[PDB]
Design a protein around this ligand. Structure first.
Ligand SMILES: NS(=O)(=O)c1ccc(NC(=O)CN2C(=O)C=CC2=O)cc1
Ligand SMILES: [Zn+2]
Length: 257
């Protein structure tokens, strides 16, 4: 099955998922000089006050912090979005070294990691239906750089020892995702796709300009996770990022001057 290795990695995905070579694939390089300020963008609204986390899962590709999305609570609205998008999960992509790990790049700069907060358009009723629509999902992308520790990340870091291997999960209630946001909500936006198979072209990407800082010790604990299951040979969960894909007929818009 698909993964991030030499024999099952991003360069192989097109054989089982031909949309890998499509017209709106993600991630992309964000050319900051070409991106144009868009005055038609409305104010972005991230309303996570009532977010209700449930569980954390190692799925063999990353780990997901899952939310109860059965009521209208943690919502993303405004910016490029029409209507309301509900938070369902977040996860990260990261590197084996501090010099790589992000999926999006900024003037070809790779960050140490990238946080994806995944939301579905409530007009489609649930996330499984939403992902089949061109405006079905909105992913808020946040870059991570190595420096000062992120206090709001530490509860995630400390539970990772309990979900080391593929298929392990743990209770993860009362986690506040507001502790993972930077100060500024300045962003770039473009139409794209899931960055993992099935690579569906159903995502509005909103990538924040300001990275968050995490400590070397925090990211080192991400790198102790395993792609493999319990009782299988250890394959460290590192470099679980897809490289930048062709921009093709797309414009990246900036929320800021
Ligand atoms: N990397 S990314 O583009 O943000 C990316 C984002 C999302 C998914 N897939 C899912 O969320 C699958 N899923 C559901 O539909 C409901 C729960 C769940 O885990 C895959 C990739
Ligand atoms: Zn992702």
């Amino acid at each position: 099955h698909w993964g991030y290795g030499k024999h099952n990695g991003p360069e192989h995905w097109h054989k089982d998922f031909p949309i890998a070579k499509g017209e709106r694939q993600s991630p992309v390089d964000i050319d900051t000089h070409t991106a144009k300020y868009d005055p038609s963008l409305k104010p972005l609204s991230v309303s996570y006050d009532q977010a209700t986390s449930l569980r954390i899962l190692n799925n063999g590709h990353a780990f997901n912090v899952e939310f109860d999305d059965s009521q209208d609570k943690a919502v993303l609205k405004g910016g490029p979005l029409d209507g309301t998008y509900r938070l369902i999960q977040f996860h990260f992509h990261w590197g084996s070294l501090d010099g790589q790990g992000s999926e999006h790049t900024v003037d070809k700069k790779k960050y140490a990691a990238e946080l994806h907060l995944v939301h579905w358009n409530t007009k489609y009723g649930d996330c499984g239906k939403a992902v089949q629509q061109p405006d079905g999902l909105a992913v808020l992308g946040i870059f991570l750089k190595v420096g000062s520790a992120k206090p709001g990340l530490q509860k995630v870091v400390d539970v990772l020892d309990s979900i080391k291997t593929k298929g392990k999960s743990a209770d993860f209630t009362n986690f506040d995702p507001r502790g993972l946001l930077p100060e500024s909500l300045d962003y770039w936006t473009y139409p794209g796709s899931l960055t993992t198979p099935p690579l569906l072209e159903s995502v509005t990407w909103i990538v924040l300009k300001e990275p968050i800082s995490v400590s070397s010790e925090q990211v080192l604990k991400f790198r102790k996770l395993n792609f493999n299951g319990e009782g299988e040979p250890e394959e460290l969960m590192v470099d679980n990022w897809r490289p930048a894909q062709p921009l093709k007929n797309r414009q990246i818009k900036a929320s800021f001057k």
